[PDB]
Paper text:
pmcCytochrome c oxidase (CcO), a terminal enzyme of the respiratory chain, catalyzes oxygen (O2) reduction coupled with the proton pump, generating a proton-motive force across the membrane. Mammalian CcO consists of three mitochondrial DNA–coded core subunits (subunits I, II, and III) and at least 10 nuclear DNA–coded peripheral subunits. The electrons from cytochrome c are transferred through CuA in subunit II and heme a in subunit I to the O2 reduction site, which consists of heme a3 and CuB. Cytochrome c oxidase (CcO) catalyzes oxygen (O2) reduction at the heme a3–CuB site in the transmembrane region of the enzyme. It has been proposed that the hydrophobic channel that connects the transmembrane surface of subunit III through subunit I to the heme a3–CuB site is the O2 transfer pathway.
To identify Xe-binding sites in CcO, we treated dimeric CcO crystals with Xe under the following three conditions. (2) Fully oxidized CcO was treated with Xe under an anaerobic environment. Using these crystals, we measured the X-ray diffraction data at 1.8 Å resolution. The strongest Xe2 peak was between the two benzene rings of Phe67I and Phe68I, which protruded into the space that branched from the O2 channel in subunit I. Xe3 and Xe4 were bound in the hydrophobic channel leading from site 2 to the molecular surface on the intermembrane space side. Xe5 was in the cavity formed by the transmembrane helices (helices X, XI, and XII) of subunit I at about 8 Å from the matrix side surface. The electron density of Xe5 was strong, indicating that Xe5 was stably bound to the cavity. Xe7 was in the cavity formed by the terminus of the heme a3 side chain and the transmembrane helices (helix IX of subunit I and helices I and II of subunit II) at about 8 Å from the transmembrane surface. Xe8 was near the molecular surface on the intermembrane space side formed by the transmembrane helices (helix III of subunit I, helices I of subunit III, and a single helix of subunit VIIa).
Author numbering:
A (entry chain L): 3 to 46
B (entry chain C): 4 to 261
C (entry chain M): 1 to 40
D (entry chain H): 11 to 85
E (entry chain B): 1 to 227
F (entry chain A): 1 to 513
G (entry chain J): 1 to 56
H (entry chain G): 12 to 83
The structure:
Amino acid sequence: YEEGPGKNIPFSVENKWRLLAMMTLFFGSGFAAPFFIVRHQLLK
Amino acid sequence: QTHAYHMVNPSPWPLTGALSALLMTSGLTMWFHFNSMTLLMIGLTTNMLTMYQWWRDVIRESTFQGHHTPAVQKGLRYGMILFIISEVLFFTGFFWAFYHSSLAPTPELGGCWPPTGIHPLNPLEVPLLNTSVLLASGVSITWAHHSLMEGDRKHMLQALFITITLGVYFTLLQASEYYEAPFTISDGVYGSTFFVATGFHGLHVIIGSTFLIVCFFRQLKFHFTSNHHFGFEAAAWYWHFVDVVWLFLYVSIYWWGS
Amino acid sequence: ITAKPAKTPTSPKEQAIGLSVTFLSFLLPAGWVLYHLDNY
Amino acid sequence: YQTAPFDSRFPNQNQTRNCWQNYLDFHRCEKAMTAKGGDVSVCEWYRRVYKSLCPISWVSTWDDRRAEGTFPGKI
Amino acid sequence: MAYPMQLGFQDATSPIMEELLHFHDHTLMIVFLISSLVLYIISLMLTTKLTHTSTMDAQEVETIWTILPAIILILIALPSLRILYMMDEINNPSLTVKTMGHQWYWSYEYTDYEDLSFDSYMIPTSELKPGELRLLEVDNRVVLPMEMTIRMLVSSEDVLHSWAVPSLGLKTDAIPGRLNQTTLMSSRPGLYYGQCSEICGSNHSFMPIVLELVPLKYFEKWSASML
Amino acid sequence: MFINRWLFSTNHKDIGTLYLLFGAWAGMVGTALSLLIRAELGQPGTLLGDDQIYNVVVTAHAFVMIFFMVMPIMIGGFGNWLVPLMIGAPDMAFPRMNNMSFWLLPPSFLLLLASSMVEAGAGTGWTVYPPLAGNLAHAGASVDLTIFSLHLAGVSSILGAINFITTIINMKPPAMSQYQTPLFVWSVMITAVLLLLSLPVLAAGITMLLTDRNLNTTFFDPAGGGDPILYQHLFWFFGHPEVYILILPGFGMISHIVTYYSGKKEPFGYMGMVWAMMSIGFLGFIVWAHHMFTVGMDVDTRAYFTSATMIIAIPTGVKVFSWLATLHGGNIKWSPAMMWALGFIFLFTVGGLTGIVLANSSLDIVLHDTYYVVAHFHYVLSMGAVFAIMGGFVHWFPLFSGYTLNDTWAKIHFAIMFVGVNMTFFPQHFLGLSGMPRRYSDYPDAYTMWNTISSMGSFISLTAVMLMVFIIWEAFASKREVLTVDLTTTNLEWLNGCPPPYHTFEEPTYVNL
Amino acid sequence: FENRVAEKQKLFQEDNGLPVHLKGGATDNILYRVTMTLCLGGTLYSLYCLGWASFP
Amino acid sequence: GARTWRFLTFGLALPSVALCTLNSWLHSGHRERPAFIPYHHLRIRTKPFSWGDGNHTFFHNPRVNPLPTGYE
Amino acid sequence: GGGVPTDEEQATGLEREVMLAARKGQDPYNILAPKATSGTKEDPNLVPSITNKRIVGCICEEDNSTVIWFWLHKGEAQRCPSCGTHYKLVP
Ligand code: HEA
Ligand code: HEA
Ligand SMILES: CCCCC/C=C\C/C=C/C/C=C\C/C=C\CCCC(=O)O[C@H](COC(=O)CCCCCCCCCCCCCCCCC)COP(=O)(O)OCCN
Ligand SMILES: CCCCCC/C=C\CCCCCCCCCC(=O)O[C@H](COC(=O)CCCCCCCCCCCCCCC)COP(=O)(O)OC[C@@H](O)CO
Ligand SMILES: CCCCCC/C=C\CCCCCCCCCC(=O)O[C@H](COC(=O)CCCCCCCCCCCCCCC)COP(=O)(O)OC[C@@H](O)CO
Ligand SMILES: CCCCCCCCCCO[C@@H]1O[C@H](CO)[C@@H](O[C@H]2O[C@H](CO)[C@@H](O)[C@H](O)[C@H]2O)[C@H](O)[C@H]1O
Ligand SMILES: CCCCCCCCCCO[C@@H]1O[C@H](CO)[C@@H](O[C@H]2O[C@H](CO)[C@@H](O)[C@H](O)[C@H]2O)[C@H](O)[C@H]1O
Ligand SMILES: CCCCCCCCCCO[C@@H]1O[C@H](CO)[C@@H](O[C@H]2O[C@H](CO)[C@@H](O)[C@H](O)[C@H]2O)[C@H](O)[C@H]1O
Ligand SMILES: CCCCCCCCCCO[C@@H]1O[C@H](CO)[C@@H](O[C@H]2O[C@H](CO)[C@@H](O)[C@H](O)[C@H]2O)[C@H](O)[C@H]1O
Ligand code: CUA
Ligand SMILES: [O-][O-]
Ligand SMILES: [Cu+2]
Ligand SMILES: [Mg+2]
Ligand code: NA
Ligand SMILES: [Xe]
Ligand SMILES: [Xe]
Ligand SMILES: [Xe]
Ligand SMILES: [Xe]
Ligand SMILES: [Xe]
Ligand SMILES: [Zn+2]
């Protein structure tokens, strides 16, 4: 296995802009979920 | 490496085990609410496949590959003791529920224990026979342990076979007593406490009997040495735990609670 | 602690972009839901 | 009679058994007095106490169960 | 009731609530002092360039830090437990009233003498009369005699509720199958408000309690008129 | 290779990394839930709906923050990364069982998110009391999915506890006694013992709730001779230990951070710190009914639970004073981690003192089921547990990643979060003293000012959470590689470099007697 | 029965780079594939069941 | 030793099981079932069971387990 | 009454290596705590390694709770930075 900084993680940090997209989707999806569950409950 | 510890090969069984837990729980939900057993039957199947392959691999690592140094064995000893402790505290919750309900019987029961309309089993009939059976199995497993330490293959197998036969006898007697019982799980807190506490106990007897049968086949295949046989020790400790839980159930629910 | 200089320095402009994108990823989806509550 | 006095048998926040015991005592006394065609006026203290303490729905449920033959207390 | 920008307890309406205010004053002084001392000591540890980084002996100082807190806890527990046992003391009530929690309203039963019971529902916001309080008024108040020891018995006919009146120092859980007792004594006439204090579903926020404390003779006529 | 490494792991560091990623994602869920709470309460009236949708959000907030954010980060993340390194062990005792503790959590979280999506959700409170949580007042699958979520989280933590206790007992260097292990290692061993004993009792209780809901048992149903109060005893027998489980690994990280940034080789009064953590663990099992002072128990029982609860202040004070004595004489480095730790010492102290107020059953009659309780527990959780997590994250991020954070950004983050959490929770003391109940979607008009200020505080905390994600991005974006770390002689976890190799201590440490 | 442990020790110590869960041979791969297929398929079915149960 | 634990297995433990088997044997046979009374604390039905017609317990014995409405 | 294998007959892999080394009074897998020498420059603690460096932890005085950790390199004896105790790598 690859060792060292940026290699001991399940996500790539090779490109900072690809990383921004991945982090945006990751943290953004967690923060969004409860708003969309509330929307779901209000729409029944 | 120049330490004695086991670096385990990357394994899929933790993930298959975790997903089997999702399938069993979502399956129970689907059975209780959506009238379907399909998810549950997939989860039980993947759970049994996971257990089989995981413990098969532990046997490969130990008997066949030699990774169980004394340091590794000492860790497994601690792990099994800690697991048994957690199982004791699980049963403690059911004993608490039992004593809570029986020491302060509510007006709905008639303000008495046993409740109005409950006809308990006679603790001197099949419950006493079950007690003799599990105590006898605690003696036979001890015989099996000493035979194994003394290097006696035939007597280990005979003693362990007797132990398993008694575990099966207990299970059949309990199944018969469940069918014959004039009270059910729906007969208020008497039925609730009786069937959930004895039912989890019965599940532990089946698990412990299964563990003993695994030890019986491993012994037939010569896996155990006279000094190295942790799976047998662990099964024996688990089996004593099952005996002791029974004695507390017998005195609490069947005798004092009658 | 001591450390090397950045292998891929993040300029003030690059930091403004990452901070902006980060804040929008939290604020736009929640803001869309809360704006539309009456509709729900 | 104003209300049910303090009863040293039931000194704690949980008064469930106080209501229950007085309801049983009234109905046991009433049965004892009607059987001999004695006088139910001797049962009056238990009646006042259970009426003071017991929720209306508990009394109503217990009365229904005595009529049905499903009351689980001994009278 | 609470008033805008309130910092502390509602003014005491009962002697036990008075006791709780004085006990809270004593306890809060201790909270303030210990919080302040810890903040001050942090600031003292952090404001010197002088150093001492070699091993430091702990045993002498640990005596002070166990004994002084033990003494402070004893000074809290003594008056705490005096009040606990005062509330529990035998008082001889003049009246017993029952309250039953329901989703989502209270019922009241006054069955010492006659069969008096009624339901008590929140006044909807759209039906408030001018000057009435949002979420706090009820249609049928709990009329009670002032300056009299009252036994309140609390239960539920469905889920858990909790019957609370902060200005009298009262909070008793409403548990189905259980009859919980508390005592109520108002030093004053007036209107005393509380709110359901155990999560009970859709309208937990909207099942308040209003006590109306009046002279015995008014309570007697009201009781008669409510049959 | 990717699947073998990240789905089939037997490596303590990679499993710790998985737990930190999981806990970070959970923290965003729990933050969104917290903002929905404060949006509902931020002006008088109704925003979302009645108390059912509101209490589904409150219930999920608590379960996510406790079981998916704090426990996975402190125990699964910091514990898996640091415990083996701090004792020179080559991995955990049961490296494959360790991976199952991790992989049970995504399914646990999925069952919780399913609970909120089916029917009307579980609007029960995180305590899940019957009969509101029963099959009449919460008919349908939501509460059963919540119970199964708790079952999987509990199995995860029980197997994790077996792993930590076995590792810490059995895998130290043979010369190292228990009295030569670092305080963080003690904090994890004691937390693990609490988990092992408490979770099985919760398991029994929620299993009884499941059978009352589905198999016609009546443990908690008076119609069958059951008792709703029995559920509360079983729940709280777990639930008081659980709050010590939430703070003990925080205490351990605080000891290491205060020692490190004071320039000290060791914490003040090591054996007193061990004594204090063991005393808190023990006393934590004998106090549960301080959650039940209004249920109608006997006066002597209330007197006992008051007294036993107050005793916890003595060992806890030894820890607070020992942290202050560790700062004393330090060469203080005003790192972001040190700021988190100093905030912890003060704000934890305030929340512990409001706990001592609540321990007084007589006063608790008026404070129970009010925002005073909410103020107490958010001082110890949102300013204690969370401040220890943030201090440990900024202290050990360079070890785990090999990269440095921007310290100026991390100090900005601390300052915003400090303002937001205090603005949120300080005014809730006033709301509790003045009688605002828990689990309300709306309040009488008098409570408006403090609810308004509290909600404004929650938005400042949101800004801090968003900035934290940017700050982690900026570290990985810039790639400032660690060179030298000070005080490695008393911080073994750093001695294999940043990040350490996949396999460490293949050759064990040499320690003589 | 005869003691065939030595023959299983030789098989499981063979220097073939296989992880322990596949080192028994082709039957291990089959049982692995069945287990993982049931797990992942069952998980997709559990998600479908949530979708379905999330609406009236 | 193994010899002593075998002595206890065959000399005490299995004889005990044989005697209790005899005891149970001799007290087997059906007792007369009691009059059905529809007590509200028994035959609890808050939700149908997930098998059969929803009204039969899992190890329902028609001879000794009445339904809410009485014996079958 | 026989038929149960012994460890001597059937132990394999690392278990067998540990078993055979213990018979010879040797500890290649570091099961035992090494006994200190006087730790002077003339009589250093001898630290075995399979490589050219190993981590030492020094418990400088009996019952210290603080362990002092450092890399010991092949070459001239090094000293514990807290107590000055001498350690020499023996690769
Ligand atoms: C990290 C989590 C955490 C921690 C550590 C604590 C710690 C304490 N808690 Fe708390 N608590 C909660 C989380 C926590 N709590 C939660 C979540 C609830 C609500 C549960 C629910 O209903 O949902 C709650 C509820 C709760 C109640 C129930 C209140 C009610 O519902 O009516 C009580 C009652 O006694 C209590 C008390 C305390 C006490 C005495 C401590 C002690 O351990 C504190 C000890 C610390 C100190 C005292 C400070 C430091 C000491 C000194 C500087 C020495 C000098 C001090 C003195 C002399 C006093 N807490
Ligand atoms: C750990 C536990 C925890 C934490 C941190 C919080 C944090 C917050 N909580 Fe709460 N809360 C509870 C546990 C917690 N809470 C519990 C147990 C209840 C009772 C539930 C019930 O009544 O049944 C509750 C109830 C509760 C109420 C009362 C609801 C009611 O009674 O009606 C309110 C009201 O304002 C509130 C608000 C908030 C807010 C605004 C925050 C904010 O401070 C949160 C801000 C965000 C953070 C603190 C970031 C979190 C994320 C991380 C730390 C991730 C880190 C990432 C890396 C390390 C990479 N919560
Ligand atoms: C010889 C006895 C062996 C027991 C085998 C029997 C059944 C399978 C399950 C066994 C597991 C044990 C306990 C689970 C709960 C209840 C079963 C109790 C034992 C039992 O079998 O009880 C029966 C009822 O079973 C019922 O409802 C059947 C219900 C079947 C579904 C069970 C639901 C599972 C509950 C979830 C388990 C959660 C585990 C938690 C793990 C902890 C994680 C931290 C009794 O029959 P009856 O007709 O009512 O009365 C007799 C009248 N003649
Ligand atoms: C209808 C019923 C279905 C329910 C599902 C559960 C059912 C059955 C499970 C039965 C348990 C079987 C466990 C088999 C373990 C085999 C592996 C084994 O025993 O492995 C041993 C190690 O022990 C170890 O890992 C010890 C491993 C111990 C595991 C024991 C676990 C008990 C399991 C409980 C599972 C769920 C219980 C929860 C109920 C609420 C191997 O070392 P040795 O023996 O020294 O050999 C080496 C020598 O040959 C060298 O000379
Ligand atoms: C309704 C359903 C809700 C519940 C969901 C069920 C949850 C999960 C599904 C479980 C799948 C189980 C598959 C088998 C797991 C075997 C674990 C095991 O046996 O673990 C061992 C360690 O634990 C030990 O010993 C001692 C500990 C052994 C414990 C075994 C499994 C326990 C499973 C449930 C336990 C909860 C306890 C109940 C009490 C509350 C081995 O450790 P490894 O790291 O593998 O190897 C180390 C190597 O050196 C070995 O050569
Ligand atoms: C390799 C994986 C691919 C294979 C896919 C699995 C196929 C499963 C199909 C079987 O479906 C079952 O059908 C039964 C008959 O309809 C159902 O019993 C249901 O209906 C019965 C008929 O009355 C009742 O008696 C039961 O109580 C009730 O649960 C049962 O739930 C359900 O599971
Ligand atoms: C780990 C702990 C395990 C505990 C196991 C279960 C404990 C059960 C013990 C009995 O419990 C008691 O029950 C009494 C009733 O039987 C209660 O009396 C209360 O309730 C009665 C009515 O229910 C009143 O008459 C009494 O005055 C009143 O004090 C009493 O307080 C309580 O202790
Ligand atoms: C607690 C977390 C949330 C905190 C507050 C979030 C701050 C708000 C961020 C912006 O969110 C957006 O706001 C727009 C409005 O400013 C919305 O557009 C809406 O309104 C516009 C103006 O009427 C229309 O043009 C659009 O079509 C319409 O979608 C848009 O959907 C929404 O994403
Ligand atoms: C490895 C991959 C994993 C395999 C996944 C396979 C998924 C296939 C499941 C088939 O779905 C079935 O649909 C039936 C209906 O179509 C349901 O019957 C049940 O529901 C019916 C509703 O009509 C009723 O007849 C009864 O409740 C009952 O028989 C039952 O839920 C389910 O078995
Ligand atoms: Cu009724 Cu809350
Ligand atoms: O829980 O305090
Ligand atoms: Cu507590
Ligand atoms: Mg309450
Ligand atoms: Na609102
Ligand atoms: Xe205090
Ligand atoms: Xe939600
Ligand atoms: Xe959720
Ligand atoms: Xe959970
Ligand atoms: Xe659990
Ligand atoms: Zn030294």
